[PDB]
Design a protein around this ligand. Structure first.
Ligand SMILES: CCCCCCCCCCCCO[C@@H]1O[C@H](CO)[C@@H](O[C@H]2O[C@H](CO)[C@@H](O)[C@H](O)[C@H]2O)[C@H](O)[C@H]1O
Ligand SMILES: CCCCCCCCCCCCO[C@@H]1O[C@H](CO)[C@@H](O[C@H]2O[C@H](CO)[C@@H](O)[C@H](O)[C@H]2O)[C@H](O)[C@H]1O
Ligand SMILES: CCCCCCCCCCCCO[C@@H]1O[C@H](CO)[C@@H](O[C@H]2O[C@H](CO)[C@@H](O)[C@H](O)[C@H]2O)[C@H](O)[C@H]1O
Ligand SMILES: CCCCCCCCCCCCO[C@@H]1O[C@H](CO)[C@@H](O[C@H]2O[C@H](CO)[C@@H](O)[C@H](O)[C@H]2O)[C@H](O)[C@H]1O
Ligand SMILES: CCCCCCCCCCCCO[C@@H]1O[C@H](CO)[C@@H](O[C@H]2O[C@H](CO)[C@@H](O)[C@H](O)[C@H]2O)[C@H](O)[C@H]1O
Ligand SMILES: CCCCCCCCCCCCO[C@@H]1O[C@H](CO)[C@@H](O[C@H]2O[C@H](CO)[C@@H](O)[C@H](O)[C@H]2O)[C@H](O)[C@H]1O
Ligand SMILES: CCCCCCCCCCCCO[C@@H]1O[C@H](CO)[C@@H](O[C@H]2O[C@H](CO)[C@@H](O)[C@H](O)[C@H]2O)[C@H](O)[C@H]1O
Ligand SMILES: CCCCCCCCCCCCO[C@@H]1O[C@H](CO)[C@@H](O[C@H]2O[C@H](CO)[C@@H](O)[C@H](O)[C@H]2O)[C@H](O)[C@H]1O
Ligand SMILES: CCCCCCCCCCCCO[C@@H]1O[C@H](CO)[C@@H](O[C@H]2O[C@H](CO)[C@@H](O)[C@H](O)[C@H]2O)[C@H](O)[C@H]1O
Ligand SMILES: CCCCCCCCCCCCO[C@@H]1O[C@H](CO)[C@@H](O[C@H]2O[C@H](CO)[C@@H](O)[C@H](O)[C@H]2O)[C@H](O)[C@H]1O
Lengths: 203, 201, 460
């Protein structure tokens, strides 16, 4: 079947260049226009399209920022991105039906144009001297540059909020509605060799 | 380019019917495609030429002559609660609009304020965290350090699979030197009545 | 017992709906499916191939059923016409109707194209056999056939005019695409097609009514009448004749070349000559030229013989088919080549029928026994032309899909333009060359031997 396999996540620095690959299978790549799309925070955009045996047609916004090419010897289409800083989004490579202009097959690859790579800091945010029935405990993760994974020891009432950028690092919070409080700990797992687990004390 | 406008970014429906509308800035001659995208997955073609399915479940139908198009889900299930996009294939520069579904529930917000930990206070920082774990709708969070503050960072999850309610986390980061303004209050304004103010001193 | 002029006129008028509907379908169905019905060109080639193939397959079966039709109180052929026209017009209207279906427009068009082909075969084949029943005198049969031929030509012109001048000037917006990078609606166009269908359907019904009123049956049927039994044996005997087989193959290939231009010339005009508006006039010009070119070649048929006539008539379009894909042909040059093609199309249909009677005389001299000397030949030619023209139109649309044809789409890509140039200037030229080469091996040589065969006709 027609399937398009992309490269993994890329992490350029500020004003570097990132090349995104789209291997094509199941169809003659030279016969179809392979497109590219730009989804930053749930808003699909259209960088450009490339006919693997000839022309490349860009959007007026991406003139000179995107550069599409096709290595027709292989079944590979590439998008090279120029200067960066706000191009952190998810990039797709659809191909249009050879008659309509709509996109039957899609991919998905995410770029992250930031700087730095640090270890997260765990702060056990706790109660302020109050209690009635169930109580809300918490765990703050601040200052990392990857995708973390916050967990609790077998308790499923947790809410881990999406991480947000503050400066150049990511911040995240986790909240648990625990009824009884004999002992509770927040265990974070980070890709860059960080596995700190901190207990939450009273007051 | 032709501007494609999906008016409602969020629509509520449980098990009956959804009518997602797409409005085109120009007469597109019934040429509108529809994409279904679950989070973390690429958009999937549903209906091209504004009426024609592509190996899709029969519940998804579409309608529209020109400049006004609809996609109807007559049997909306748990998978159908995803993000739906409409595309024009009339003009050279293709354009998309963006819309999403969610189930319906009641209401009722909850709030809790948490002061900075001793460990954070040691390392030159102070984050006051306001949690709003369970509510339905849209909400606004105000910080009062005896005065309104505009340095707070906010984050919102999606919708809980079981509770069908949203959450919110508001973080107020203040340095140790500026950590003497009095008492810190977090005020919530949901579709209820009165400010859900939780405070610490 | 002699047929009145009014009765022959009614019989001729009854044969107009087939020509009108066939001309409208052959000239506009490909563009209707691709650009109006918004079908995938893969799905709009299956429809054309299956439609034609089911016309070719259903003309002999319907012929057999007519041959086994008993005598009613209205006739052996009138029940077929009267019971087929109300459904034929319904299916014909529903060919040009674009349904609101989520999946399976192609099934709709397949079902209703095949049903219209079946229910117009059940109108034409009894009609084609009606000439043996309207009168018993051969002169009256020939006069009615001449009226039918003239009305067929005028109907092929009138249907082109009617479909063209109603689906034109209501053009829809074009679906510009990547190549194009750097009020009338589409529903205003589809309704136009429906209106055209309605008009044609009206004509259909009206002509059928005329065919019911002006024509009798006279069931004497020339006392004992032979029935086709040795169909395969007679076909083999006809194919065994030299001149017959040569004429069949040459006429078949020439009519294939000109049925490969019947369908792919609207697309070539729209997307290669930049005539998205005037393409329904250019076609009319060609047809109009044909209407004024049948007499001329007839004079040629007497002026300079038939061998040179068939030699130059089939090849009179070759320079212009080469020129249309090389010269720009802004406005007037296309019309000049259209007039040339309307001379050539008239030649390439009149001349082989003029050749035919010599071949019939030669077969009679060679084979005194008469077993479908003309009927079997005509059925074979009609079947093979319909089948192979369907194969050619299906391959044309499939090649357009493989070339990346854009539905509507203003400018088409270079590959689709190349395929259109090939489908108008390479395949028709190859087919015409093959037909001419087959016509070269013509042992009859017209009056060199045919008149001598006439002497044999005097002897026997
Ligand atoms: C010589 C005879 C000529 C016959 C020509 C037939 C060509 C047209 C055949 C129908 C079109 C087939 O094209 C394809 O087939 C499959 C299988 O049926 C169908 O697709 C299928 O997918 C969904 C999956 O939920 C099924 O529930 C449903 O049965 C069907 O719609 C569609 O119809 C079409 O996607
Ligand atoms: C000779 C007699 C013919 C009898 C029938 C033989 C036809 C055999 C093909 C039948 C099935 C066709 O289905 C095949 O699958 C794809 C979908 O996956 C169809 O779909 C194709 O056209 C549609 C346009 O409407 C596009 O939206 C789609 O992206 C594209 O892949 C094609 O129409 C066909 O390539
Ligand atoms: C003499 C000439 C005049 C004779 C009468 C001509 C009138 C023309 C009326 C035709 C109207 C039919 O138009 C079309 O038919 C099909 C029949 O399945 C119907 O289509 C229906 O079935 C499909 C199946 O998925 C679904 O989309 C839905 O159930 C519905 O749209 C609709 O009704 C319409 O899309
Ligand atoms: C006055 C006149 C009244 C109107 C008369 C109309 C005649 C009725 C014929 C209408 C046919 C409509 O078109 C019909 O739609 C259905 C559903 O999409 C198609 O069905 C198609 O989808 C289904 C999936 O459920 C599969 O079986 C398969 O993909 C295909 O068969 C039919 O193949 C097609 O023939
Ligand atoms: C309901 C009306 C709409 C139907 C659409 C098509 C109608 C076309 C109208 C055609 C009417 C012209 O009718 C025309 O009359 C003259 C004689 O008068 C015929 O002319 C013929 O008459 C003599 C009779 O001895 C023949 O030998 C000779 O072959 C030929 O000259 C034409 O062959 C015929 O076609
Ligand atoms: C031998 C028989 C000779 C008959 C030849 C003449 C028959 C009648 C010709 C058709 C009349 C054409 O008339 C012209 O067609 C266009 C088609 O878009 C029509 O224009 C309008 O038609 C329909 C009618 O409701 C509207 O819905 C549509 O909005 C619009 O297209 C108008 O009616 C007229 O501007
Ligand atoms: C001798 C004269 C012969 C008479 C010819 C009559 C044949 C039919 C032509 C009718 C033209 C009138 O125009 C008619 O208007 C209605 C209302 O928009 C259209 O009906 C439309 O309604 C809805 C809403 O848009 C849609 O499903 C679709 O666009 C279409 O079905 C018809 O598709 C069109 O045919
Ligand atoms: C003498 C020959 C006569 C030829 C002229 C006959 C023309 C008869 C009218 C055909 C007009 C075509 O226009 C078509 O009409 C049919 C109704 O019949 C409509 O058909 C529609 O009707 C209902 C609404 O009532 C819809 O729910 C359904 O989708 C569909 O079946 C189409 O929306 C329209 O596109
Ligand atoms: C044997 C049948 C003979 C019929 C041949 C002629 C029938 C067609 C003539 C209809 C013309 C009337 O139609 C009205 O006039 C103008 C004349 O520019 C037309 O305008 C259009 O047609 C003319 C040709 O006729 C072309 O220059 C061009 O396609 C466009 O300008 C419009 O379509 C319409 O507004
Ligand atoms: C009864 C017979 C009916 C007649 C059928 C006529 C069909 C004519 C076939 C045309 C071929 C269509 O196929 C189309 O042609 C172009 C030719 O540049 C080809 O294009 C391909 O070959 C060219 C070399 O010339 C290279 O640039 C490259 O390998 C690729 O682009 C593709 O294969 C396809 O895009």
């Amino acid at each position: 079947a027609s399937k398009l396999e992309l490269s993994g996540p890329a992490e350029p620095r500020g004003s570097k260049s990132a090349q995104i690959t789209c291997k094509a299978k199941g169809f003659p790549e030279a016969r179809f226009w392979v497109f590219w799309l730009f989804q930053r925070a749930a808003a699909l955009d259209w960088p450009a399209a490339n006919f693997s045996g000839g022309p490349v047609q860009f959007e007026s916004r991406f003139q000179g920022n995107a550069s599409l090419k096709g290595s027709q010897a292989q079944a590979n289409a590439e998008l090279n991105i120029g200067a960066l800083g706000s191009s952190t989004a998810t990039y797709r490579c659809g191909w249009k039906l050879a008659n309509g202009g709509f996109f039957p097959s899609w991919g998905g690859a995410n770029v992250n144009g930031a700087a730095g790579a640090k270890a997260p800091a765990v702060y056990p945010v706790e109660i302020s001297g109050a209690g009635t029935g169930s109580v809300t405990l918490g765990c703050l993760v601040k200052g990392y540059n990857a995708k973390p994974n916050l967990t609790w020891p077998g308790a499923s009432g947790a809410l881990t909020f999406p991480s947000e950028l503050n400066g150049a690092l990511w911040n995240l919070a986790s909240a648990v509605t625990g009824s009884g409080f004999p002992s509770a700990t927040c265990a974070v797992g980070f890709g860059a060799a960080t596995d700190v687990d901190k207990k939450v004390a009273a007051a | 380019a032709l501007d494609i406008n999906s008016p409602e970014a969020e629509k509520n429906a449980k098990g009956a019917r959804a009518r997602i509308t797409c409005n085109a800035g120009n007469q597109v001659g019934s040429a509108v495609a529809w994409f279904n995208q679950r989070p973390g997955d690429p958009a999937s073609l549903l209906t091209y030429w504004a009426a024609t399915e592509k190996g899709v479940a029969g519940k998804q139908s579409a309608q529209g002559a020109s400049t006004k198009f609809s996609m109807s889900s007559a049997g909306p299930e748990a998978p159908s609660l995803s993000s739906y996009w409409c595309l024009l294939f009339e003009k050279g520069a293709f354009s998309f609009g963006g819309s999403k579904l969610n189930p319906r529930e009641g209401a009722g917000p909850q709030a809790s304020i948490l002061p900075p930990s001793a460990d954070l206070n040691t390392s030159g920082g102070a984050a006051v965290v306001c949690f709003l774990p369970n509510w339905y709708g849209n909400i606004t969070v105000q910080w009062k350090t005896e005065a309104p503050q505009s340095q707070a960072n906010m984050s919102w999850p999606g919708q809980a699979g079981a509770n069908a309610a949203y959450a919110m986390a508001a973080v107020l980061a203040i340095t140790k030197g500026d950590y003497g303004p009095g008492s810190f209050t977090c005020n919530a304004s949901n579709r209820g009545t009165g400010p859900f103010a939780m405070s610490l001193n | 017992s002699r047929l009145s002029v009014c009765s022959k006129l009614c019989y001729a008028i009854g044969g107009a709906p087939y020509q009108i509907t066939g001309c409208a379908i052959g000239f506009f169905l490909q563009i209707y499916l691709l650009d109006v019905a918004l079908l995938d060109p893969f799905y709009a080639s299956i429809i054309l191939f299956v439609g034609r193939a089911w016309d070719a397959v259903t003309d002999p079966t319907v012929g057999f059923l007519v041959s086994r039709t008993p005598w009613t109180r209205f006739g052996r052929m009138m029940p077929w016409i009267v019971l087929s026209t109300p459904f034929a017009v319904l299916c014909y209207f529903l060919i040009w109707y674009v349904p609101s279906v989520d999946q399976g427009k192609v099934v709709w068009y397949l079902i209703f194209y095949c049903c219209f082909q079946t229910l117009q075969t059940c109108f034409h084949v009894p009609y084609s056999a009606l000439t043996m029943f309207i009168s018993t005198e051969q002169k009256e049969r020939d006069s009615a056939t001449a009226y039918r031929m003239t009305v067929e030509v005028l109907g092929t012109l009138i249907g082109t005019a009617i479909q063209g001048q109603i689906v034109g000037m209501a053009n829809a917006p074009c679906i510009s695409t990547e190549i194009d990078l750097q009020h009338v609606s589409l529903q205003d166009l589809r309704n136009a097609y429906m209106i055209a269908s309605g008009v044609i359907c009206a004509i259909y019904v009206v002509c059928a009514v005329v065919l019911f009123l002006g024509v009798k049956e006279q069931k004497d049927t020339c006392r004992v009448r032979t029935e086709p039994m040795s169909f395969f044996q007679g076909i083999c005997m006809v194919m065994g004749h030299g001149p017959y087989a040569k004429l069949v193959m040459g006429f078949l290939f020439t009519s294939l070349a000109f049925m490969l231009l019947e369908g792919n010339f609207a697309l070539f005009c729209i997307y290669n000559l930049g005539f998205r508006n005037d393409f329904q006039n250019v076609l009319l010009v060609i047809m109009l030229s044909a209407t004024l070119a049948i007499p001329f070649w007839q004079w040629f048929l007497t002026k300079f013989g038939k061998k040179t006539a068939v030699y130059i008539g089939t090849t009179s379009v070759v320079p212009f088919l080469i020129s249309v894909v090389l010269v720009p042909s802004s406005l007037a040059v296309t019309y000049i080549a259209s007039f040339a093609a309307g001379v050539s199309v008239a030649a390439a249909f009149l001349l082989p029928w003029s050749m035919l009677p010599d071949v019939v005389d030669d077969f009679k001299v060679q084979n005194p026994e008469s077993q479908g000397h003309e009927a079997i030949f005509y059925s074979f030619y009609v079947f093979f032309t319909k089948f192979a023209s369907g194969v050619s139109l299906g391959v044309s649309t499939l090649s357009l899909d493989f070339a990346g044809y854009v539905t509507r789409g203003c400018t088409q890509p270079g590959e689709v333009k190349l395929t259109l140039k090939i489908l108008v200037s390479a395949a028709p030229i190859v087919l015409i060359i093959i037909g001419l080469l087959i016509f070269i091996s013509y042992p009859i040589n017209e009056e060199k031997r045919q008149g001598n065969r006439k002497l044999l006709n005097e002897q026997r």
